[PDB]
Every structure is written in structure tokens, then in C-alpha cells.
Design a protein around this nucleic acid. Structure first.
Ligand SMILES: [Mg+2]
Ligand SMILES: [Mg+2]
Ligand SMILES: [Mg+2]
Ligand SMILES: [Mg+2]
Ligand SMILES: [Mg+2]
Ligand SMILES: [Mg+2]
Ligand SMILES: [Mg+2]
Ligand SMILES: [Mg+2]
Ligand SMILES: [Mg+2]
Ligand SMILES: [Mg+2]
Ligand SMILES: [Mg+2]
Ligand SMILES: [Mg+2]
Ligand SMILES: [Mg+2]
Ligand SMILES: [Mg+2]
Ligand SMILES: [Mg+2]
Ligand SMILES: [Mg+2]
Ligand SMILES: [Mg+2]
Ligand SMILES: [Mg+2]
Ligand SMILES: [Mg+2]
Ligand SMILES: [Mg+2]
Ligand SMILES: [Mg+2]
Ligand SMILES: [Mg+2]
Ligand SMILES: [Zn+2]
Lengths: 91, 99, 50, 69, 114
RNA sequence: CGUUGCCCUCGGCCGAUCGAAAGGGAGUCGGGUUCAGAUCCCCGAAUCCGGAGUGGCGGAGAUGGGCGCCGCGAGGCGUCCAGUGCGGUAACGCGACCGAUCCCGGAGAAGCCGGCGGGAGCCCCGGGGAGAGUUCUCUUUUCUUUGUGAAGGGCAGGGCGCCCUGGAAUGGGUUCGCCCCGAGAGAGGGGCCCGUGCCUUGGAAAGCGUCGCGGUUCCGGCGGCGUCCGGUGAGCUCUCGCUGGCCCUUGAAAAUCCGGGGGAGAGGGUGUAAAUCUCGCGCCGGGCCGUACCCAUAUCCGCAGCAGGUCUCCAAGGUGAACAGCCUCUGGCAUGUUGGAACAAUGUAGGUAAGGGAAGUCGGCAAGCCGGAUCCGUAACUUCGGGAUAAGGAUUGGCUCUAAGGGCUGGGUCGGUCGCGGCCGGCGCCUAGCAGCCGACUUAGAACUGGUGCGGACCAGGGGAAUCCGACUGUUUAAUUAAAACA
RNA sequence: AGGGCGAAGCCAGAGGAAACUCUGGUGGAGGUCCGUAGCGGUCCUGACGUGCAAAUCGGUCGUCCGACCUGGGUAUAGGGG
């Protein structure tokens, strides 16, 4: 809290849009601009390019992910289920 | 180096309009060196007399067209800048002429 | 305009030829009712079939 | 245009069918030899004066040799 | 100061109407119109973002004029594809075929066993 | 050998066609020339595209190696094979280097915004010249002017997400910001791209500046001299480049052009061939239409030479934050459809007013106050971001000084030997650096000074306390309603 | 144009046993503020009102990186757009 007590990323917006909305945006607004780790090389370069598409700059691995996160929870839970059923079918 | 600039005034003197000795004297007075008017900055520049032709002979850096200025100043003092005109005859030289 | 089609240029040319005033020998013809051209078009007032 | 470096090479270029005017510019300290062709204007810089005077004679059948002034 | 005008009837400053200042032998600043900037070809691999070496990056309708050597490079996949992606293609294509052979061998042993 | 007829063989497309004088789209520039046209005429330098058959010529393909003889030897013949180019560890290179249908790829082909860097044009400064103006006094003066097209070749200067060596924690490298590294950092060596910058061919012959002649004339006449050297930068304009930021916005197609994978074919048989996405040269051609001028306080539209409207490019000095205003050069005008003489009332547009200070009026409408900068100082309230230039204060000129901020280059001196310079060996090793040489510009402080004047013109917020409405930015009745209406 | 405010990220220093927090920088966000060109059109209920003008003029104003301004091309036509 060097410059701001409690706005951070959403200090750009100034007074506008209301407190709740700006608090609500701060979560996403952070995550979406986060640089994640490319589970492919392991550098911290997974960066959202456009909605649902994240690109490693080093790996050059474009990756269909979430709108504001490299992974949605939904996607993750769906992944594991499919893996479980796959194993249940084939044996 | 040896910077040798003539300043010949042949046919204003032959018509008897000005005197070259007085012009030499005026040039020995004025010609400034390093921002000092009198004494030619010591034994630095040297002014010669040959009836009509003046020669200025410097050792230090010395502009040519400073002689044009001072002739123009001298010609104004004598009320000659009207029918007398300074021109570069050749390089290292000026030349007083009529119109 | 300085970017003309050929169609338009030719159109203008004829218009430019039509402007000239009557030849005075016409006045001396036998059954002459014509004194002046009366179809004269000045560019500054009256502005073409366009 | 094209500069040339061998006195022989310019002589060969001058000897072509397509060539014509072989004008010669005494610049002082240089003496060029400009020989026009179909496509290009070949020039050759010959720093020596006596060597240029010698070459002057070595152009062949009755070309223009239109010396420049 | 010498201001200046465009030399063509295109008034608007556009991709087509780009210029540069030049002093002539006549000692007048004049506009010369400038040729667009050509790009080197990018790789056929499609991952390597960097454009290819040893090729004259020039406007494509020029290539026509150019000599073959300018337009490519002496290698397999020359001036189409970056080296790195060739020497990975090579050893990939080799190593793959060695495993295909190993699976063929394991298949043939299984037939002889059964 | 062409040309055609027939037979077989192969062939996806994708919609005929139209649609851009600003999108895409090969290739032209310098000088001259007109009463009026010039990238179009003339001179000179280029260039693309198409053709080029019989192939016009060189060069490449390609002229090896073997064995057998004969010859002192250089070599000559006989006979056997090879020959769709070579160099580099590599990035990749070299003037050419066969090849079809088919396939893959690229280029054409990409938003806006920020920051930083390089290159030019212009400005600036210090000087050289040539011509000027000033000269009562002063002024080595102030003013002008001081050049090199495209296309080639060279070389700086940029950039590289290219390669090789090698192996980095005491982690390093490094940007204004970042950002990069065992998926290979630093360090060394290279490779490629752009090269609009220099040099050079062009090209001094041409241009410009000066002095000077030839000619009653006509005359694009002819000569001299010159066209120099340096330095600066959050400078501005354009541009090339790198690197970020923004998006529930992700920012054109196609014609055209190339590369690669393939390997169906073709070539001649030991001096030559087919082959040149041909290398260098040579020859021939490029039709059609537009091209005057105005482009706007007089060539356009508003009935007109109408204070209206109407898309762009270029863009000097001073002051200054500044493309603000004010004054200036370059260039341009004659005060906007008239003149003269008066200076009454009413006006229109400006100003100023003693004492009071909104008593005026529906209402502070109108005008006035405030205004820049630096330094202090800053409330309630709050969605904690704001409010905020809150409010409220002080300073500001001229002059003469001081201090503080940067770059470049230099020691390998002693001894030897070789030609002030090199090479070797030994000291030295400024390793707290010191010395000389350059150059923008700011900031702070101090003295003195003036009739307290100083952001001296220009530019340039009046504040405060509360209530009502609508969250906000946005939009709206062209021509009486900008709002609380719509969004 | 030119200025103001100075959001994330980044650096250092200081404290903290940790969690992390302070101080100074850097950085340059935004339907952010001032303010030019541009776009507009509040008030003077000013000028004009047989006008310059069948809606103009002057000052004063709003906005000026965004639901921004704007040329050309192209689409929608009358109980229709
Ligand atoms: Mg009209
Ligand atoms: Mg175009
Ligand atoms: Mg190459
Ligand atoms: Mg068409
Ligand atoms: Mg390295
Ligand atoms: Mg014209
Ligand atoms: Mg104009
Ligand atoms: Mg008047
Ligand atoms: Mg008048
Ligand atoms: Mg008028
Ligand atoms: Mg009063
Ligand atoms: Mg009353
Ligand atoms: Mg009252
Ligand atoms: Mg008021
Ligand atoms: Mg307040
Ligand atoms: Mg209430
Ligand atoms: Mg509102
Ligand atoms: Mg209205
Ligand atoms: Mg209104
Ligand atoms: Mg009114
Ligand atoms: Mg009236
Ligand atoms: Mg009038
Ligand atoms: Zn690759």
C-alpha cells in the first residue's frame, strides 16, 4: 500500500463506476494482466493475448484457456472427470 | 603561416582623390588584434606602402574582409563611398574602383 | 475538374464552340430577323447541362 | 553509369559495336574517359596525365573522341 | 525556409503518397516519392517469429527482377524455412521412423509368439 | 519446325460481370525551355515490362581422372569411365547453376497509444570566403549567399527472437521503463537485413554567387575567380527501428510476385548437348483517355465578386510551456462594392470614473475581481480514488557575482633492438585517479540597484456555505427549448 | 499543440522475529483535468433584424484519445426509411 490504500489496479478508473463495480473489477483486472507460468517450458510468460487465448512468448504455445484466467475451475473439473471416465471405459 | 593581403588603390590615387600615406596611417591606427586597436597587437601584423598598393602581412590568423570593412570605414570618413567601390580583384587582394 | 472523362471533354468542346457570336454578314442576308446570338452562355452565370 | 578500373577494360568497352562518343574530361588531377554505350556510360579515371595522353592515341577506328571543354 | 509541394495530383498523405526530402544539384529541396518497405519472408514452420536470413527483403513484385541467389539460401528448405526448424524436422522425421520400425519389430515378435 | 484437324491423357473450385483519380498495384530522375505546357517539350543520365524465332554475342553447364602407347621433356594419339556448379564447423556465401502436373509456404497483408534510439530537412552557434547595408560616435559589423537527382559500387550507422566456442549462485547481464539466462547468461569470435547517411561513378561539362568582357542589334554569347571548415541539441518536421500498454474492440480482400517439397521427364556421348526462376552484355516495342487555370473574404455551392459553407500537403526568427497571443523575414496584399468635409443628438464597439458598494434588477444580467510561475499552506465531506489551482499566504524586474550539475583524449615512461613509428622484455600500473581539450543548458544562493516597479504588453480560474435534479463521460429539437429530457 | 494530476508494475533504503509496513525514486494508467486546431453552440435574451446571411457576426462559452472529428464509396424510400 505504497501509493494507494485500497484501489491498486482499479485506481485508473478514478471515482467512476461505483465502489462495488470497481472492487469487482479488481479481481479480474489483476488476473487477466497476470503473467502465468508456461507449463511447456516453465518460464513465467503465459500472457493473455485476447479473451480465452493465452500465449507463451518463449514457448510460442498459444493456449485456449479462460476469459480472465489461464484456467477456469470448470475446465479443470471437466478435465479430471473426462480422464476418470476414459480410464473407466478402456480399463 | 604568412597571411599576405594586398589592398591596391591604383586609380583613385592617380586621379588624386585620396592619399595612400594617410590610409596606411589610418590602418596602422585601427586594425585591431585580439581586441586591442593600437600598436598592431605588438609586432604581429605589418603594413606596407608602395605608392598605390597597400599590403598587410600577418603571422596570426587574420581575416581578409576585415580590410574591406576598414577601407569602407575609411572611405566613408573621407566621403568617398559614393564614387569609390571596393572589390576583390583576386584572392589575397581588394581593389578600389569607380562605378 | 482536371480529371475529365473523354465523354465529358467532348461535350465541353461543343459547348465551347457554340458560344461564339453571330457573323455580321448574316445580318445582311435577305430575310434576316436575327440581330444577336441570344444563346450565349457565360461561365460565371448559368452552369451547363451538368 | 559505371566506373572502370583497368585501362584494358575501357579499351575493350570502347571497341564494341554499340559504342560511340568517347569524350575526355581533363579535370586537372584526374583526366576521365567517358565512353557512352547503348545501356551505360562507362567512365575511367586515369590519374596520370602522360598516361592519359598515351591512351588518347590508342582509341581505334575513328570514334568521336569528342574532347570536352 | 523553402517550403514545398507534392509532385503528383495525390494531395492526401497516404500509404501511397510517402516522400522524402532531397537536395538536387540545382540547389533546391525537392520531394522524391519513396518506395514501400519490403519484408523478408517469415518461416514455413510458423512458430519462429523471426523473419528469414539471406533473403533480400523487397516488395514482392520485385522478386521477379532479382537473381535466384538473393531470393533463397543454399539448404534443403532454403529461404522457405528457418534452419532450426529444418534440423528439428530432420531429426524428428528420423527419430519417428526409428520408433515406427521398433513398433514394427515388436508387432512381428508378437505374431511369431502367438 | 511451325500451324491446325481428329483420337487418347489430365484438370476441383466457386462464379459471368461491375465496384476505389485517398485501399492494393512493376517501372523516372537532374538541368534547361514558354506570353500560357512541362517528372509529359530539349539536353543528359536512368529504368521496368513484353518480345528476341533462325537464337545477336560472350560466360556458366565443362571440359577432369584413368589406363595404354609414342616423345629427352612440354606434350601427341588409342582406348576406358566420371561430369544437371562450388565454398564454409555453422549462421550462411559465391555471377549463372535442368526440370512438368502436384503439393506447402511466404510476400501483397494490417488497430490505436506510449517511451526510447538512429537517419535526414529546417533552426542554432563558431569561424573561412563573395557581394551588402551601417559608419555623427561605436561596431574584425550586421544582412544575403555559400550545391549535387535517380540507378549502381564501396563504406559508416542502425537492427537481429542467427551461428560457433563455452559453461554462469558470491548469481550475472542490462533498459529512461524493462527485459534475458542450463530451453545456454556474461566473454570472445563470426553470419544476415536495412543502409533514405557519407565517398564515388553520375559530375562540373551542368546549377548557383560574384567580378569581367563580346554584341547599335540578333544573341540562351563567352571568360575569370568561388562554391570552405568545424560544433551543437527533451530543438521542431518526416522517417527507419526497438520496445512496452489497451481491448467482452484483436484492427480488409483480391489481382499480382516469389521461395521451398517433390522428382514425371529432357540432354550429349568425351567435345559437345539439352539447360540457364541467366550472369554479363546486344536488338525491337509500349497503344488508348486525362494533363490549361481557379481551388476561395472574386473562377465551386448558397439567385450575386454574399462576413455562410466546402477534403488535404508544405510550414522560417523573437518572446514563451506552447502550432497561445504579440512583433518580425521569405512570399503576399491594398483594408474587403467608393471618396471628400465636419465631429451634433440618438446609437454599435471600446475605455475611465470621487464617496458608497448590489441600496439596481424577476434575478449580480452586464462588467469587475481572480489569473502565469516558484515557495509555503490546504477544510468539510468521501465510493479512500478524490475534493484540490480547495481556501489562505509570500515572492517575481534590472544589474554584478557564486555554487551545483557533462563529454572527449592522454601513462604500457626503463632497457633492447627494428624502421617521430613499430616489435620484444622488464618495471609502472593514476586501479582514491590526475592532466589537457571541448560543449549545451538549467536550478539554487548572494551583493548592489530603481519614485515598491517587476507574470509591467501579450497570455491568464473570482472564491466560499448550502439545498433540488440527474451518478458520471456521451446524446438531443439544422432555424426560439441543452435540460432535470434520451443514452 | 503545450501543460496538470500521477493508477498498476519496478528499484533502493529503513523497520519488522514473521506478516508485511513505511520513506525516497522510477513508471506513465485514464470514455482523467486545464487548453490549442478540430468539433460544437451556453449567456449577453449583445450585433444584425427590407441583414453579409431565407439563421449570419462579436465576445463569452462546452468539448478536445473517445460512445472523438472528418473526405470518398456503399446500404436503407414515403404509412416507407
Ligand atoms: Mg457560381
Ligand atoms: Mg492508390
Ligand atoms: Mg543468399
Ligand atoms: Mg473493376
Ligand atoms: Mg553472450
Ligand atoms: Mg496543372
Ligand atoms: Mg491557397
Ligand atoms: Mg477600415
Ligand atoms: Mg479603399
Ligand atoms: Mg470584397
Ligand atoms: Mg465609482
Ligand atoms: Mg428596488
Ligand atoms: Mg434588492
Ligand atoms: Mg456574467
Ligand atoms: Mg469545494
Ligand atoms: Mg432533503
Ligand atoms: Mg447528466
Ligand atoms: Mg434548436
Ligand atoms: Mg440554444
Ligand atoms: Mg438578440
Ligand atoms: Mg434597423
Ligand atoms: Mg460588406
Ligand atoms: Zn523455426
Amino acid at each position: 500500500a505504497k501509493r494507494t490504500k485500497k484501489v491498486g489496479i482499479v485506481g485508473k478508473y478514478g471515482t467512476r463506476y461505483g465502489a462495488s463495480l470497481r472492487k469487482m473489477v479488481k479481481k479480474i483486472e489483476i488476473s487477466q494482466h497476470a503473467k502465468y507460468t508456461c507449463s511447456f517450458c516453465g518460464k513465467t510468460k503465459m500472457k493473455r493475448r485476447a479473451v480465452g487465448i493465452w500465449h507463451c512468448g518463449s514457448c510460442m504455445k498459444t493456449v485456449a484457456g479462460g476469459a480472465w484466467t489461464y484456467n477456469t475451475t470448470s475446465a479443470v473439473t471437466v478435465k479430471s472427470a473426462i480422464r476418470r471416465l476414459k480410464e473407466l471405459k478402456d480399463q | 603561416q604568412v597571411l599576405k593581403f594586398t589592398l591596391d588603390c591604383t586609380h583613385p590615387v592617380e586621379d588624386g582623390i585620396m592619399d595612400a600615406a594617410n590610409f596606411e596611417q589610418f590602418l596602422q591606427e585601427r586594425i585591431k588584434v585580439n581586441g586591442k586597436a593600437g600598436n598592431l597587437g605588438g609586432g604581429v601584423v605589418t603594413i606596407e606602402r608602395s605608392k598605390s598598393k597597400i599590403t598587410v602581412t600577418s603571422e596570426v590568423p587574420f581575416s581578409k574582409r576585415y580590410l574591406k570593412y576598414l577601407t569602407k570605414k575609411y572611405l566613408k570618413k573621407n566621403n568617398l563611398r559614393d564614387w569609390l567601390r571596393v572589390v576583390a580583384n583576386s584572392k589575397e587582394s581588394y581593389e578600389l574602383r569607380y562605378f | 475538374s482536371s480529371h475529365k472523362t473523354f465523354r465529358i471533354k467532348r461535350f465541353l468542346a461543343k459547348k465551347q464552340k457554340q458560344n461564339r457570336p453571330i457573323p455580321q454578314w448574316i445580318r445582311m442576308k435577305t430575310g434576316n430577323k436575327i440581330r444577336y446570338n441570344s444563346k450565349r452562355r457565360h461561365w460565371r452565370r448559368t452552369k451547363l447541362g451538368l | 553509369p559505371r566506373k572502370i578500373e583497368e585501362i584494358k577494360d575501357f579499351l575493350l568497352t570502347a571497341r564494341r559495336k554499340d559504342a560511340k562518343s568517347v569524350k575526355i574530361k581533363k579535370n586537372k588531377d584526374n583526366v576521365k574517359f567517358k565512353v557512352r554505350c547503348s545501356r551505360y556510360l562507362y567512365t575511367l579515371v586515369i590519374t596520370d596525365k602522360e598516361k592519359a595522353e598515351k591512351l588518347k592515341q590508342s582509341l581505334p577506328p575513328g570514334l568521336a573522341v569528342k574532347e570536352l571543354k | 525556409v523553402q517550403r514545398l509541394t507534392y509532385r503528383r495530383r495525390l494531395s492526401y498523405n497516404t500509404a501511397s503518397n510517402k516522400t522524402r526530402l532531397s537536395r538536387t544539384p540545382g540547389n533546391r529541396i525537392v520531394y522524391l516519392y519513396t518506395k514501400k518497405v519490403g519484408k523478408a519472408p517469415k518461416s514455413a514452420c510458423g512458430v519462429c517469429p523471426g523473419r528469414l536470413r539471406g533473403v533480400r527483403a523487397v516488395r514482392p513484385k520485385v522478386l521477379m527482377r532479382l537473381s535466384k541467389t538473393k531470393k533463397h539460401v543454399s539448404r534443403a528448405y532454403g529461404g522457405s524455412m528457418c534452419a532450426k526448424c529444418v534440423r528439428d524436422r530432420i531429426k524428428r522425421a528420423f527419430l519417428i521412423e526409428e520408433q515406427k520400425i521398433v513398433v514394427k519389430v515388436l508387432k512381428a515378435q508378437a505374431q511369431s509368439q502367438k
